[PDB]
Design a protein around this ligand. Structure first.
Ligand SMILES: O=c1ccn([C@@H]2O[C@H](COP(=O)(O)OP(=O)(O)O)[C@@H](O)[C@H]2O)c(=O)[nH]1
Length: 351
């Protein structure tokens, strides 16, 4: 049982970028599942085998991590064309991992077909005809299914909490009590504007000491419908394997989702915060049924409620330690089901 795993639009090498870290993380959790896995990427590396040194049909399973089909500057994107050429030539079913609601499986030939350098490829070489199995990180397959309106070869949809890989990795540990230097923290990118209201709502004009580390830049927050005067401190991106440690320098850390993730997806970020020394403060809208933790102190409705909750946390160390303790405990109850998650994942990839 040889499994192949690939990022459909991103080069994989180390943990300096999120799309490469997510792929490497997955390869690990699968390998620790007792499975035999190889990551296939642009060039050979510490975790990767090169696409043109491997014949995709040697694997009994091709798992593909989501990606856009965006050709920056309109110019060829080797990550995309190499991966699609790779997938197009596999004869069996493809397990597409849907971790981001913004990256449905999509066919590149349509794009390419119309670019000026089209002649450099052929339909035969890039059109994926194999049947696809979408594995949804979100519990709502109508949102998953809706997202893949335009693609026809996608005959199967299944739910699987893919992002729990982080809490299931064998090297996992909860963050230790760290010296506080921030009130509230949040890491990520701008999401192409997909979450501007929530980010401004909760991180701008709060009066608190807040940082937003990631690929998000202040200049991107320019939508008139969502005005602000005081933006948080935007630092740069840090490796995916440092996140909890970063998160841990803040009293609290923020959970906000895209409108479609609400009561739908549980995101990687949720575990990254729950395993950290920063108290988890979730937007009430993101999980209205409090499935993440059943205590209303972990949920906030607006900027004002968030500011109030941090004030209480800054005031009562007892309440702060108590809540981290609760979230840490609650995190482990899920980790206690590591086996059932391994089994479910296997079943999901037809094993
Ligand atoms: O400097 C940073 C900021 C974010 N992340 C990763 O990016 C993820 C969040 O990605 P996104 O902005 O798409 O947010 P989401 O939609 O997942 O909440 C986090 O969970 C981290 O794993 C990271 O590795 N380094």
């Amino acid at each position: 049982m040889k499994i192949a795993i690939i990022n459909m639009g991103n080069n994989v090498i180390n943990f300096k970028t999120v799309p490469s870290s997510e792929t490497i993380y997955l390869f690990k959790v699968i390998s620790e599942m007792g499975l035999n896995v190889d990551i296939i990427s642009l060039k050979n590396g510490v975790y990767t085998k090169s696409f043109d040194e491997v014949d995709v049909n040697d694997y009994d399973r091709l798992i593909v991590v989501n990606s856009s089909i965006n050709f920056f500057g309109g110019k060829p994107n080797l990550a995309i064309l190499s991966a699609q050429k790779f997938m197009a030539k596999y004869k069996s079913k493809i397990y597409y991992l849907f971790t981001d609601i913004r990256l449905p499986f999509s066919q590149s030939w349509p794009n390419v077909k119309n670019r000026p350098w089209a002649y450099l490829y052929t339909e035969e070489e890039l059109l994926i005809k194999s049947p696809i199995k979408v594995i949804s990180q979100g519990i709502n397959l109508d949102i998953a299914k809706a997202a893949h309106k335009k693609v026809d070869n996608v005959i199967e949809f299944e739910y699987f909490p893919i992002e729990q890989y982080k809490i299931h990795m064998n090297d996992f540990q909860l963050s230790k009590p760290t010296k506080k230097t921030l009130d509230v923290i949040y890491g990520g990118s701008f999401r192409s504007g997909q979450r501007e209201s929530k980010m401004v709502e909760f991180l701008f004009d709060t009066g608190l000491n807040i940082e937003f580390f990631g690929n998000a830049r202040e200049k991107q927050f320019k939508n008139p419908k969502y005005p602000w005067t005081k933006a948080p401190v935007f630092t740069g991106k840090i490796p995916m394997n440092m996140v909890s440690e970063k998160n841990s320098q803040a009293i609290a850390a923020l959970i906000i989702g895209d409108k479609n993730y609400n009561d739908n997806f549980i995101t990687l970020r949720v575990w990254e915060t729950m395993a950290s020394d920063a108290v988890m403060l979730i937007d009430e809208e993101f999980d209205t049924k409090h499935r993440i933790i059943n205590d209303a102190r972990f949920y906030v409705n607006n900027r004002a409620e968030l500011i109030d909750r941090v004030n209480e946390l800054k005031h009562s160390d007892v309440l702060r330690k108590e809540m981290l303790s609760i979230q840490h405990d609650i995190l482990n109850k899920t980790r206690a089901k590591k086996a059932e998650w391994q089994d479910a994942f296997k079943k999901a990839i037809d094993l």
